[PDB]
Design a binder for this molecule. Structure first.
Ligand SMILES: C[C@H](C[C@@H](C[C@H](C[C@@H](C[C@@H](CCN1CCCC1=O)N1CCCC1=O)N1CCCC1=O)N1CCCC1=O)N1CCCC1=O)N1CCCC1=O
Ligand SMILES: Nc1ncnc2c1ncn2CCNC(=O)c1nc(-c2ccccc2C(F)(F)F)[nH]c(=O)c1O
Ligand SMILES: [Mn+2]
Ligand SMILES: [Mn+2]
Length: 178
């Protein structure tokens, strides 16, 4: 039982922790062992949720659901809006901008992480939005979807999590593991 596991459980709302646990066990991974990946799965989950709570019924949340139902909704959006079915599961869908969104949270330079995912998805359709634990962000065609206030809020949350890890001497392992 690690210090990181107890921190994760005390730092994040219980629904987020359980969803992160479910996702990992779906891929055979143990939150009790891969504890830095545990914290990461939760942050990304929280960021996605804060992101969806930043617009007006504007976004359809795709992250958090089980694989099959996530794809079911993706197909239903694709066969309603016309948009082609993504190669990989996205994180949200914008009914206002009419595009899927891939959210990223990284401990490295925002450029590197965006480039990796863009080359990964290849399709010019799914919109990419990267956040860092230092408050930078980078989004496709410089289009950041939400208003600055809701996005700055996410960056503040990420930096508070980073400081909380540091005070507990867990940050260096977390950063040195992505
Ligand atoms: C107190 C308040 C609570 C948050 C909760 C919300 C997370 C998310 C909840 C679940 C619903 C579960 N299932 C099971 C299957 C069908 C289904 O839907 N999932 C996961 C998959 C998508 C989804 O819907 N929901 C519910 C409503 C919309 C939403 O996104 N959110 C959004 C902000 C961060 C967060 O946690 N709510 C409730 C509405 C307003 C709000 O903020 N919190 C917690 C801390 C911050 C905060 O404000
Ligand atoms: N290794 C895995 N473990 C559980 N589930 C996995 C999964 N790979 C795929 N899936 C299912 C669908 N995954 C996603 O959608 C998704 N995964 C990530 C990611 C990837 C690797 C390590 C940590 C992360 C995370 F950022 F969460 F912490 N980042 C995203 O931005 C994102 O959208
Ligand atoms: Mn995802
Ligand atoms: Mn993502």
């Amino acid at each position: 039982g690690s210090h990181m596991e107890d921190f994760v459980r005390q730092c994040f709302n219980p629904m987020i922790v359980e969803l992160a646990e479910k996702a990992m066990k779906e891929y055979g991974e143990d939150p009790k062992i891969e504890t830095n990946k545990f914290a990461a799965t939760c942050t990304h989950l929280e960021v996605c949720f804060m992101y969806s709570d930043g617009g007006s019924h504007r976004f359809e949340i795709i992250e958090g659901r089980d694989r099959i139902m996530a794809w079911t909704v993706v197909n239903s959006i694709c066969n309603t809006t016309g948009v082609e079915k993504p190669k990989f599961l996205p994180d949200l869908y914008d009914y206002k901008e009419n595009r899927f969104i891939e959210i990223g949270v990284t401990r490295r330079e925002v450029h590197i992480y965006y480039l990796e995912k863009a080359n990964k998805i290849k399709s010019e359709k799914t919109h990419i939005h990267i956040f860092s634990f230092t408050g930078e962000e980078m989004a496709t065609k410089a289009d950041y979807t939400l208003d600055e206030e809701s996005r700055a809020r996410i960056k503040t949350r990420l930096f508070t999590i980073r400081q909380e890890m540091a005070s507990r001497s867990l940050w260096d392992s977390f950063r040195q593991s992505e």
